[PDB]
DNA sequence: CGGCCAGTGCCAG
DNA sequence: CGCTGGCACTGGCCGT
Ligand SMILES: Nc1ccn([C@H]2CC[C@@H](COP(=O)(O)OP(=O)(O)OP(=O)(O)O)O2)c(=O)n1
Ligand SMILES: [Mg+2]
């Protein structure tokens with residue numbers, strides 16, 4: 001259910017998505033990133049229908065994050081028609097993420 | 106004999122006011138202070154000591170006080186004042202001779218904490234007086250509410266300046282007597298604080314006379330400066346900067362940016378077990394933040410636009426762009442390209458010098474090609490840093506007179522060699538290295554227009570031929586009866602070695618021969634000749650056999666200094682120099698180098714002194730308002746500006762005569778020679 | 792930020 | 805065990 005993005009598919013998979021897309025900017029060496037990973041795997045299942053969860057590894061895809069002034073990871077960007085609708089940085093818990101998604105969806 | 110010191114309003118280059126001075130006279134045993142209106146009287150007292158055939162002791166007076174007084178006397182009193190060289194003593198010059206194994210702050214120009222080893226106390230004090238005085242001044246002001254400006258402590262005379270002037274002299278007097286108490290340089294039977302100048306120079310060790318003459322000549326050289334082509338270097342800077350920018354563009358295309366953790370304070374701990382994970386990036390758990398903002402009793406709380414949420418940890422990161430100057434960056438990108446670092450440093454970092462770069466091999470042909478762009482980039486930086494952007498860049502040092510007045514510590518190296526700095530004119534890129542011609546041509550007599558006729562001057566470059574090998578020949582003459590000394594002058598020695606050693610360039614043969622002569626290992630020898638350790642061994646034995654007296658010389662030196670040895674037990678830890686001084690030996694394996702480098706340094710030192718003296722007694726005047734001007738002394742070479750070609754021809758011939766004179770002066774067992782070149786600049790004259 | 796200061800390398804003789 | 809030197813850059817660390 002989770003979309004594995006790349007620098008070259010980011011534009012059409014996210015910016016032209018036409019729908020709600022939660023993008024997770026992460027890295028294999030970040031503690032918090034590993035923490036929230038399993039939470040996203042489930043958030044995708046549940047919210048399937050009104051939201052798409054996508055991940056972008058900033059090491060393998062170094063060109064996208066800079067355009068959003070990424071200052072910390074994991075960075076969670078909720079995209080809405082090619083425009084950031086909301087941003088939250090940190091390993092939020094299951095509930096917290098839900099609170100965030102319900103409040104912006 | 107008198108001991109003196111002055112306080113003026115600025116460094117030599119722009120001093121315009123004499124603030125005060127102090128004189129301690131040995132015959133009266135009293136101190137006398139001269140304030141600003143006493144300037145004329147102060148000068149009178151100095152000249153009086155000269156009329157008595159006496160001596161004047163300053164600490165760093167050769168480079169500062171003496172020239173400063175001449176300048177100030179002319180400006181303020183419109184008087185001609187010129188203390189004669191033979192009447193002056195410099196405790197800094199003496200300290201550097203006697204305590205040649207110690208460093209010093211060069212009168213406060215170098216931070217004391219950056220220097221290795223210990224520092225002589227009185228000299229340290231004298232060197233810190235300016236900064237120390239500035240502290241007092243600044244404190245007294247902020248103690249009075251007033252603000253401290255730029256460096257106002259030197260704008261006007263005041264009683265605290267007077268007191269420091271007095272302390273400098275008492276300290277200089279103490280330093281002097283401590284140095285004079287050195288039996289090796291000053292015979293115990295003579296009270297050197299109670300003799301005329303002729304007795305002082307003739308009764309003390311030869312080295313004392315040579316050091317004072319060298320310092321007096323070299324201070325003059327500094328004042329002369331080296332005519333510099335500012336325009337050509339600014340243009341070179343543009344060319345180099347353009348190339349740097351283009352290399353950066355290509356390299357940053359090849360090696361893209363990336364993120365690294367930065368600014369993390371908290372330790373990341375396993376959420377399950379809870380154990381600290383020090384290998385994971387530091388994190389940052391925020392305290393402020395939530396989904397919504399504090400309330401709203403059944404009416405949707407306003408969403409918190411906040412980017413964080415208290416409790417949820419994250420890893421702070423910075424975006425970093427590939428920097429070709431960073432060995433770390435280069436290391437990261439190349440290993441990521443499959444490079445397997447072979448050699449590392451004594452700290453766990455992979456070596457990233459030109460040898461390894463040239464040998465790196467990666468599969469991706471683009472990155473494989475970027476390795477050459479990196480080599481170029483680093484070299485370009487070396488040139489830019491030295492010529493324009495570095496703290497000691499030539500462009501930052503050009504004076505208003507269009508010259509660079511590089512500084513010289515006449516006896517800064519333990520062996521008796523001099524050191525150069527601000528900027529170091531003894532490390533200008535060679536004409537055969539990238540951009541060398543442009544760098545070298547920018548330093549030249551042609552860039553100085555005569556003050557009267559406006560015509561450019563000419564340059565005379567003279568360099569001692571195969572200096573240290575002739576020194577070797579000399580010292581091993583007692584073992585081979587002058588065999589090598591005779592063979593050495595059969596055609597050029599370095600060119601001959603080049604051929605036999607089958608080396609590419611004449612310069613490469615020099616780096617080889619001296620690397621070999623001074624203990625390079627089989628491997629190092631290989632590196633120098635661009636081969637392996639096997640080729641290193643071949644050349645080692647091949648040249649040792651040719652002249653087995655080398656081993657004999659090496660053995661005698663060892664038997665003279667060591668009795669056993671890690672850690673060494675010394676019989677005596679110094680070599681007696683050609684002029685009698687003690688030359689501190691740092692290590693048994695560098696002893697031969699100490700012996701030969703010292704001999705060559707003292708020969709060259711007496712050489713530049715004798716050359717100038719011979720020119721003077723021939724009628725030539727030293728200065729831009731005269732016939733010739735020393736512009737630089739780089740170990741065994743002098744570059745001299747000359748008003749005319751004829752004078753250049755005479756300087757070149759005179760330099761040769763003087764060299765032969767030095768050889769005869771010390772009964773050298775190898776004939777000494779020089780090679781001279783006339784031309785407009787340093788690219789042609791060396 | 793700008794002095795300090797180790798590490799590393801390279802320039803010359 | 806090349807040795808004698810100066811100095812530029814990066815990157816860690818700390819205080820106006
Ligand atoms: N890599 C080097 C080059 C030089 N030197 C020393 C010994 C000689 C002295 C002066 O250097 P050069 O003038 O370059 O050497 P030279 O033997 O005088 O050669 P030339 O005859 O060409 O001047 O510096 C050294 O120790 N290591
Ligand atoms: Mg003084």
Ligand SMILES: [Mg+2]
Pocket residue numbers: 568569570571572741
């Ligand atoms: Mg030479």
Ligand SMILES: [Mg+2]
Pocket residue numbers: 568569739740741742804
């Ligand atoms: Mg030379």
